[PDB]
Amino acid sequence: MTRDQNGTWEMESNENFEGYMKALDIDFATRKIAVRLTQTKVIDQDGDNFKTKTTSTFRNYDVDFTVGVEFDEYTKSLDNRHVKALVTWEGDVLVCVQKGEKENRGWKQWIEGDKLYLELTCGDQVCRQVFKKKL
Ligand SMILES: CCCCCCCCCCCCCCCC(=O)OC(CO)CO
Predict the structure, then answer these.
(1) Rounded to the nearest whole angstrom, what is the distance from the C-alpha of residue 100 to the centroid of ligand 1?
(2) Could you tell me where this protein is found in the cell?
(3) Which residues have a Cβ under 8 Å from the Cβ of 26 and sit 6 or more positions away?
């Protein structure tokens, strides 16, 4: 069922979110706040149509997309940049490339049973997050 990412996922680990944020030029005051936050991620998946919501005490980030359809992503409340984003399946891994000002920007998201993994990349920095399927 490795492509079914539907549900609510609760963060349990968040490695080098700081390195990823610094690569995006996030201001120090925001990084100092955001590096501690536990995140929740809600995915509404209907085949290749995705509606996702990543939430916290500090800020939320929503992004909707269709696999294989390049779209104009505006990273509101993150680094507030415009990127051309494409999400595709590479095996059972959901792979997004975000081309714009920053090089080697994207993410990879996949399921392992009751765990959701998300690797965020920007240039020289990789952030590794693990979420647990909501109890
Ligand atoms: C980082 C600057 C200040 C943060 C301030 C606090 C925000 C924490 C929650 C949102 C954090 C969201 C990070 C990117 C997630 C992403 O875009 O990938 C998703 C798209 O679908 C994969 O599910």
Answers:
(1) 17
(2) Cytoplasm
(3) 34, 78, 79
**Torsional class of 22: left (φ above 0), alpha (ψ -120 to 50), beta (otherwise):** alpha
How was this structure obtained? X-ray
Residues with a CB atom less than 6 Å from ligand 1: 21, 26, 30, 34, 37, 39, 41, 52, 54, 56, 58-59, 61, 63, 78, 107, 109, 118, 120
DSSP state string for 12-76: EEEESHHHHHHHTT--HHHHHHHTT---EEEEEEETTEEEEEEE-SS--EEEEEETT--EEEE-T
